[PDB]
Amino acid sequence: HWGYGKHNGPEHWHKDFPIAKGERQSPVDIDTHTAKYDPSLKPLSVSYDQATSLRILNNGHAFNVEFDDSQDKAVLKGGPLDGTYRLIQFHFHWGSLDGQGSEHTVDKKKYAAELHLVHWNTKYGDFGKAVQQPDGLAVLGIFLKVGSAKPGLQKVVDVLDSIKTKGKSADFTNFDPRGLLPESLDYWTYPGSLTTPPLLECVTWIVLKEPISVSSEQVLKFRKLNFNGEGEPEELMVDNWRPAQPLKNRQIKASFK
């Protein structure tokens, strides 16, 4: 099955998931000079005061911090979106070295990592139905650069030792995702897809302009995770990012001037 190695990596995904070559794939390069300021975009509304984290899971491609999405606790609204999108999980993509790891790029620049806060449109009733719809998901993407530590990330990095291998999970309650946000909510937006199989074309992407800073030590601990299961030959979980895909007939809009 699919992964990030030579033999099962992004260049192979199209054979099981033909939509890999579709018309609205993600990630993309954000060309800052071509993205047009759209004065009709609203401020995003990130309402995470009542967020309820439950568990952290190594799923063999990344680790997901999962939320209680059984009612409207943590939601994303506004910006390019109509309606209410419930936070279900967040995860990251990162590199083997600081010079690569993000999925989106900004004028071809790759960041050390990228955080994805994944939300589903509650008008579809459940996540499985939402991913079948062109406006089913909203993913808030946040770049990570290496510099100063991010205090709000430390609880995540401290639990990684306990979910080293694929299929391990740990209790992860009372985590506040507001501690992973940058100061500004200025963003770019475009229609796209999940960036892992099944690559469904169901996502309104909202990518924040301001990266967060994390420390070298913090990102080093991401790279000690394993793609493999317990007792299997060790394959460090690094470079779990899909490269930029063709923009095709899409426009990336800026919320800021």
Ligand X SMILES: CCCCCCNC(=O)c1ccc(S(N)(=O)=O)cc1
Q: Which residues bind ligand X (CB under 6 A)?
A: 116, 118, 127-128, 131, 139, 194-196, 198
C-beta atoms surrounding 33 within 10 Å: 5
The interface partner of residue 198, options being Zn ion, ligand X, none and the CB cut-off 5 to 8 Å by kind, is ligand X
Q: Considering the complex, state which of residue 35 and residue 207 has its C-beta at the smaller distance from ligand X.
A: 207
Q: Where are the beta strands (DSSP E) in 79-127?
A: 85-94, 105-106, 113-121
Residue 93 marked ligand-binding: yes
Q: Considering the complex, state which of residue 1 and residue 257 has its C-beta at the smaller distance from ligand X.
A: 1
The CB-of-5 to ligand X minimum distance in angstroms stands at 18
7: annotated active-site residue: no
Residue 204 marked ligand-binding: no
Q: Considering the complex, state which of residue 116 and residue 150 has its C-beta at the smaller distance from Zn ion.
A: 116
Q: How far apart are CA 130 and CA 81, in angstroms?
A: 14
Q: Which of 24, 86, 104, 116 binds Zn ion (CB under 5 A)?
A: 116
Q: How far apart are CA 65 and CA 55, in angstroms?
A: 6
Residue 12 marked ligand-binding: no
Handedness of CA 47, 190, 245, 110 (dihedral sign): negative
The CB-of-40 to ligand X minimum distance in angstroms stands at 26
The CB-of-116 to ligand X minimum distance in angstroms stands at 4
Q: Which of 7, 12, 33, 61 is catalytic?
A: 61
The pairing of beta strand 187-192 with beta strand 53-58 = unpaired
Residue type at 252 in one-letter notation: I
Question: How many degrees, rounded to 5, is the angle at CA 248 between CA 11 and CA 6?
Answer: 10
Known catalytic residues?
61
Binding residues for Zn(2+): 91, 93, 116
